[PDB]
Amino acid sequence: KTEVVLLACGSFNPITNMHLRLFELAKDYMNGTGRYTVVKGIISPVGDAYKKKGLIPAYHRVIMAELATKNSKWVEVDTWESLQKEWKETLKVLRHHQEKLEAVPKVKLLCGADLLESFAVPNLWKSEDITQIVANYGLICVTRAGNDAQKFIYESDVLWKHRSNIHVVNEWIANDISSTKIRRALRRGQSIRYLVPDLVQEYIEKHNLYSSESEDRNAGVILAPLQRN
Amino acid sequence: KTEVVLLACGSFNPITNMHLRLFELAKDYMNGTGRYTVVKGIISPVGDAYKKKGLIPAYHRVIMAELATKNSKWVEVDTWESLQKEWKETLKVLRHHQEKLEAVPKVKLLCGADLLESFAVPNLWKSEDITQIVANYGLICVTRAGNDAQKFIYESDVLWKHRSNIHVVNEWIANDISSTKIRRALRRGQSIRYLVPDLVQEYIEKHNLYSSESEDRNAGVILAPLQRN
Amino acid sequence: KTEVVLLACGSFNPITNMHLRLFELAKDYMNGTGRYTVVKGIISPVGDAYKKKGLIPAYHRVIMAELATKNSKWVEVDTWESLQKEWKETLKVLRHHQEKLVPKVKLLCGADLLESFAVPNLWKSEDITQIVANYGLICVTRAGNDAQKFIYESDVLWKHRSNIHVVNEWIANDISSTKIRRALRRGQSIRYLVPDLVQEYIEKHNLYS
Amino acid sequence: KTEVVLLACGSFNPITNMHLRLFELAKDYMNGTGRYTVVKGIISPVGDAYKKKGLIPAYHRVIMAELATKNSKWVEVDTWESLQKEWKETLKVLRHHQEKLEAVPKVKLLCGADLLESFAVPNLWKSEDITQIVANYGLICVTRAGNDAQKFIYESDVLWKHRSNIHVVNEWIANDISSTKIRRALRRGQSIRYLVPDLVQEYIEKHNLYS
Amino acid sequence: KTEVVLLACGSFNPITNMHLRLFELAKDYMNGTGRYTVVKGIISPVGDAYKKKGLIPAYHRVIMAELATKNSKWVEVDTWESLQKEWKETLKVLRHHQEKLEAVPKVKLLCGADLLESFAVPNLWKSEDITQIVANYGLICVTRAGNDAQKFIYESDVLWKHRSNIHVVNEWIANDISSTKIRRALRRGQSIRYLVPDLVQEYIEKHNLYS
Amino acid sequence: KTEVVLLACGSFNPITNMHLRLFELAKDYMNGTGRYTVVKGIISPVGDAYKKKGLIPAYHRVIMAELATKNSKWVEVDTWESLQKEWKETLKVLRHHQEKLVPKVKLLCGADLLESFAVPNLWKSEDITQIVANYGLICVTRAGNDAQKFIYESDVLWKHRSNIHVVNEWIANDISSTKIRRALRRGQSIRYLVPDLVQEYIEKHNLYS
Amino acid sequence: QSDEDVIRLIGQHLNGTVDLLMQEPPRRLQTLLRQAVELQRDRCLYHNTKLDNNLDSVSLLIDHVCSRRQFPCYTQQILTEHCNEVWFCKFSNDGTKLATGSKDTTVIIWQVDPDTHLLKLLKTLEGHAYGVSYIAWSPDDNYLVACGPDDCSELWLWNVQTGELRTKMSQSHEDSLTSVAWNPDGKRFVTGGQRGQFYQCDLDGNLLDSWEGVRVQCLWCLSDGKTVLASDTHQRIRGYNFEDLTDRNIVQEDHPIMSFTISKNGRLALLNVATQGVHLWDLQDRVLVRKYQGVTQGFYTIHSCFGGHNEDFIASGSEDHKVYIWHKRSELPIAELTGHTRTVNCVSWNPQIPSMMASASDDGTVRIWGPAP
Amino acid sequence: QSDEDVIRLIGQHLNGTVDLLMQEPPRRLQTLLRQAVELQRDRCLYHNTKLDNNLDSVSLLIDHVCSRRQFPCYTQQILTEHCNEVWFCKFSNDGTKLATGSKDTTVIIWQVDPDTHLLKLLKTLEGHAYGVSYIAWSPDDNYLVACGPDDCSELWLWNVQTGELRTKMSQSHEDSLTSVAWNPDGKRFVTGGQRGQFYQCDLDGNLLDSWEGVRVQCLWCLSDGKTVLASDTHQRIRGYNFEDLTDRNIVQEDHPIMSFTISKNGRLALLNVATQGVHLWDLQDRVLVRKYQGVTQGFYTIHSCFGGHNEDFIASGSEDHKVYIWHKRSELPIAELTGHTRTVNCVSWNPQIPSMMASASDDGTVRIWGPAP
Ligand SMILES: [Zn+2]
Ligand SMILES: [Zn+2]
């Protein structure tokens, strides 16, 4: 068999149940195919240079993610990406983790429905980067609708040519507790119990992290990859 | 203001996240309407005389529900219903809890999309019972789709006449982790982490409760209310 | 039981059956809520200062509305906006009628104005909050989930969700003004779509051709 | 060009603006197709021999229909169907009205999008009955959705063989005031003004028909 | 009855069974209404003056179309459009073919459900152009969904005023082999047998047109 | 690279373009999987012992299929089921061809047979498990989520999910036999729907009228 | 200085001829000796708190220690006689007899020879269909009541004198009877089940009383002759009194109470807790006393017991395939003795002989522990 | 019996005229006295483990006790002089001075009068923009370094002799500097922030070294002059050595480490834990020693300290508006003295004078605790 290490690099602002149910589903699917052996998963929050809208400083999110994965036996919260002064592309962080794993498992990017759909947004991805990612490391995506992913793979040509490295994982026990709805409910003053681990929830109300002032903090600023490219 | 005690009587085979998120949502709505003050919630699993398909014995489910509501500060797991020799109708258990609360809060039935739709199934509910429940105690329903509940109330006549006692609560943070899917995933050998509280999950694997033999244990037997009516 | 007055501020070019059905539905819902009492409804057509497209002179629309509401027992038409020579705002008109009128005034609309609240940078958020908080809103729609969806997304509307009532309508009645105008342009008969007196008026004066 | 007389049946319990609008749409389409000249429309309420479905006595509905069409000009109410001791299939009504007119314009039936569906349910309509109805007189179908009616015509073999005698008219105004919904509104004491002619509303209020 | 000649334009890059089936459906519908007698069909591939859209040279497409229609009888390929130094609006093609026939059956254009949509986008079609096209010759629209075409006709004023010269034909077999999809299949080296005539498949394989 | 033989067991009344497109698509997918190699495809029409409705004598269908597959290079038609005088089962036929044929046989179907597995109490669960485990399934469907939905619900299919391949088809081709028969009954032309030789055969022999 | 002070103290104590010794506070020398003796007792490891506490009759020449030769540390007999498992084992009230309940059909009586403290099979009882899971001896060790697993709807009462089956009991087929407890009067017993049955029954097989509303897991009849302690489902132990129909609350926990035992003094309760170890609760003050650290126990029924002289040691089983012993003043275990292969669930201590211990395993061994050789 | 044994022991001990006393093991009487003294020390409550342990020079006439008169239990001075809050307060290394850092703009120096042990304001320092959250004194108490909250990008170094602001430091505007630690050489300091800056800086304002990859919360420079202990984000305390670029792991926990302090012996670490209380870790064996029970502390920064003679008592604050003191051998608190209104966060102990204690509150009080009247 071959050894695979899953790597997830997103926002995690804040971390919820789906961000862990994704890892559980991916491990289940990979171990059930009889051709892989998942041994580790990595969470890598993005730094503040991403210049997204309403992004809280990095250390809050890192501590949240560390609190969430306290009981898990195979998930780590490595944070090399977040400390860099400049924004790092996905290929660079993938390469960094892969070459750290040597100085042997193969690292595979864990994805969802949104990123595969974002591949089509113009001026958001370099084509050489896309082909490198899809044909040197891998790509795993878990989606509510399987046919949407298959269709999007069909329309392009590089994805079709390298389609044996893209594994689409279907999920039937629905969860769509996205971060924006969590923040919106938290701003009004509702209860977000049983959608996040309890320690994260207690930390959130202790520090009073999310409010209107934090939400409206990056308006009109061009997103970091767009400005650089 | 008036005091409200929410009462939920279902199956809880096994208990999941929605069965608690429902209580949180109901408390939020009732305290936000500015006309009520929720002080307690009750979980009442149904006894074995219900003769449903693939229903595990009562004490397992009662202990599960007790483990789930260990940290909650306002939810009880009263179990008067489950110990009765014969099957008890909903009106009888509502009356029992209401008259126990005296020998003053008003008790309100907590419902979902399925039961309001089941009112229309023939020979499943006595009309006198329906009007008694809707016009003496109350009814609260939380649904994915609001217009379905409003339409269902509109078509009938008793529900329309007593419509000021039926409060429809919408929910936008999706969660549909139903019990049947949980059991199906548990039978195959998948992971149900982050869909149930951890203690319930550990208790589930320890005793090996759910399997095919427990699943095919009530086939063709008429459901208890249908046989009595 | 508070005393409430309903106000409609639309173009009304021309008036059809759906507007009067809206008034009837709103009154029925408000009286059946159990805490209200409707006493008067006002229709105020928009003046001709707007300088829009397809908008006939205001006096014709006022006469049409006067013919339409003649047989009603509690609906009246107000003719102040049409006579103003400068385009006034909705909040100013609401204030003017509230001072002229004690019963509180409320606004009648549909799903179009609630959506038009949320277009990017058209209304002033202070204006929206004064309209919602001081006066209120009755939003009679053929679709129910969409109004609540709009209220949920908007923070101001959710903050003032207690002064907004949405009324579901379960009878399909989509007699829009544009479709009536299109039908009239080609000579299609519109009998039983529009009240008899106003239909005869339009046929006599050849308003649309 | 040829003459044509439109005939509509049903129960009309009560009568609403939908049916009058149906006559108006059918007339406009027929005059606009450029091959006919509509001259008359007839309404035939069902008599008191059908199986009860919450149906009020015949004379109430007949006088209601007369009150509705009093202002109209080219629409008449025929009470022959109501004054019969036995239920009659619509083919007999078509034949009787055609015979009366001959004693000659062709009579065309008016129907909604539900009659086409009912033509297909097994053991409800005889093959010869549908053949006679579609071949001798013909139908005009006024539907909110036109694709479904075309599909219903396409599957049925008799209708396809006689597809030249079936017309389909599209309604681009979404108003379907079904009699059941308005009866339910009447039952609860709500207001049905501006959905039914004013005279009919006054009469219903006066006699207190539904309660 | 009157004679009629069906004319179809486009690019045909390449030609598929969809277009031939469109011709057959149009012929069957036109003969089935009992007011026309179709006598000829003409295919006019676009020449090498249009803005490039991955278009192969004209002679390749012309000989492909000839190879497709070699077995047919009443369908011809006209190469006048391809052998021109300037791009021509379809109105000029209609006029030229009508003039050639006169030197008299009416010419009817054949189009899909997309031309009706393109008639409405602003600043693409002149009002006089659409008026001439719809009033002098007319259109036949073959669509998978008929409700949308009727809606497109209903909104547009010129089409509504000339709605008697526009025909709509329903296709009850769901096969739309779009040229883009088959070009993509050719690019990846897959097999397109049984979707294109056998001779055209052999010709495409021999010359290796797309790669 | 294993050697695989595709088998089609359908009525084929009559044969159209979609079946040959199915064969081409299945071969393309199997060779492009990277672990397989297709060597032969067999079409076996159902015999006339079925005593169904609208089923013409088997010799006509066999001749039609022979005409249709004449030009192909790797497709053959087998004529054993038609000659049997008793209605045999699918598993028996699969066993018979496997023994007659080392390459392994596999079954070609659509979304209809996968759904027909799950009808209440028609097939025997042992029969289903032998078919799935011993031979396999290729499900060339125009819809992708539905096949996986059916596999998820069924416990046997999920247990043997490694021997079932679903192939998505992204070109709309719905030339069913019933629609062809209906078109032929009324005299509508079916040219370019069906291969030329077999269309000429049907027109010559007036099979459907 | 210090030497003079010590000499003065000694001279004072010898006053009870120091007149010539002087030339050459109250009684203070004695209390120093008493404090030294107290420290000596404190430092003692395997202590015994009876006849050695609250006394002043200890020698002074040699430091106090207690013998651990009389302490169970060495296995002697491996009574491998059953077939599938040995779910339970308990010593009689007189110390002469042992009763081991297996998994298939047997409860076996082993008699000890007081000359050599060695066990031998005496008589065997059969007929049980679903196995034996709980055994309760009569106060005079004349009958024993044997109950099976959670779905056993009947219970068997035996006669240790002969082995004949006296009248068995079964109220209904749809029933469950798991726990039993004798009465001090020696003529009635209280049985209880997980389904909800909580009875009060006569020896001949009749029924005298019953309750409803409580799912009892473990029962214990107190010495007062009227009070019965019962374990509930809401993680509580409650006292129930018949002829008064009264109930009172004395213990509340945060996890299921899998099993509990009550000392002979009727003062303390030693009880196992799921996902933790072994807890000790004082009923008079309703106060937790100790929380002994380290037992691998998930959601599994594992029994423990008191032992030693004056109920000084606390013995328990675990899923580590080992047996743990504690002294009743320490967090950490005293001896984590091993030897078993599968899990250990029903360790027991001899009531009379203070150096005999039984360990029933999951592989069919009843290993007997006694003094080291 | 016992009387004869005692007489024999006394007669033997007096051998160091017993020849006539006889008519009328090794040295054993002495060790009994030693054991009694050991028990007396054990029973002592407010003990002191220096010059009183490992000794045999205690009197025997009266039982040993330690005084409580010299123990902080009674409030004396309420230095209500700030405006908003008193976030921090720390005594100098010499015991003469106190420095209290407020919320708005002030760090205030209070000088004690050794004649009467009473405090008076001496000098005030202003200029801080976002408040003062951490203060570090130089080894000779000549300079103090002041750092503000988590978003303070500059730090202020002062001159206690005059109050003049020596060179303040700020490497970049996008920075955070929260923790500081002096070097034993007294001429360099290590500063660190939450963002990731971890520097090694000269007194005049230059930069000598830096690291990357670590988010340090609290630092401490060891006595070896080369090793620096730093608190990480993964709930660890790690040792970093410059000029070797080496790192080693010595402590790992299960919750955030909010603050930590290291004893003068460089042997133990006293550290607060969120959602629990106060823990003590031995670095040599890397072993947790004690888990002191009871402090209301959620996710909030609360400082504690060592105190007493020979670092015997452990003092801490809490959110109960109280102050807790512990003896370093017990689970339970010794004195839960109260008096504050809002929360207490920076309690401190005098290093030199063993009876002076400072308690800084959230309402602007610096309440000083000393001996009871
Ligand atoms: Zn001892
Ligand atoms: Zn002391």
Author numbering:
A (entry chain 3), B (entry chain 4): 6 to 108, 148 to 273
C (entry chain 6), F (entry chain 1): 6 to 106, 148 to 255
D (entry chain 5), E (entry chain 2): 6 to 108, 148 to 255
G (entry chain A), H (entry chain B): 122 to 137, 143 to 150, 281 to 629
Q: How is this structure described in the published paper?
A:
Here, we discover that human WDR26 binds the metabolic enzyme NMNAT1 and mediates its CTLH E3-dependent ubiquitylation independently of canonical GID/CTLH E3-family substrate receptors. Cryo-EM structures of NMNAT1- and YPEL5-bound WDR26-CTLH E3 assemblies reveal an internal basic degron motif of NMNAT1 essential for targeting by WDR26-CTLH E3, and degron mimicry by YPEL5’s N-terminus antagonizing substrate targeting. Within the supramolecular WDR26-CTLH E3 assembly, the WD40-repeat β-propeller domains from two WDR26 dimers are exposed and provide multiple binding surfaces for NMNAT1.
All visualized NMNAT1-bound WDR26-CTLH E3 assemblies form giant hollow oval structures centrally encapsulating the hexameric NMNAT1 substrate, overall resembling the yeast Chelator-GIDSR4 E3 encapsulating its tetrameric Fbp1 substrate. However, unlike in the Chelator-GIDSR4 E3 where dual substrate receptor Gid4 subunits bind N-terminal degrons of tetrameric Fbp1, the data suggested that the centrally facing β-propeller domains of the WDR26 dimers mediate NMNAT1 recruitment, thereby positioning multiple solvent-exposed NMNAT1 lysines in proximity to CTLH E3 catalytic domains. A 3.8-Å-resolution map obtained by focused refinement enabled placing atomic coordinates for the β-propeller domains of the WDR26 dimer on one side of the complex interacting with a pair of globular NMNAT1 core domains from neighboring protomers in the NMNAT1 hexamer. Substituting the WDR26-interacting NMNAT1 core residues with alanines (core>A) only subtly impaired NMNAT1 ubiquitylation and binding to WDR26-CTLH E3, suggesting that other interactions anchor the complex. Notably, a motif we term NMNAT1basic due to its consisting of three basic residues (K126, R127 and K128), anchors WDR26.
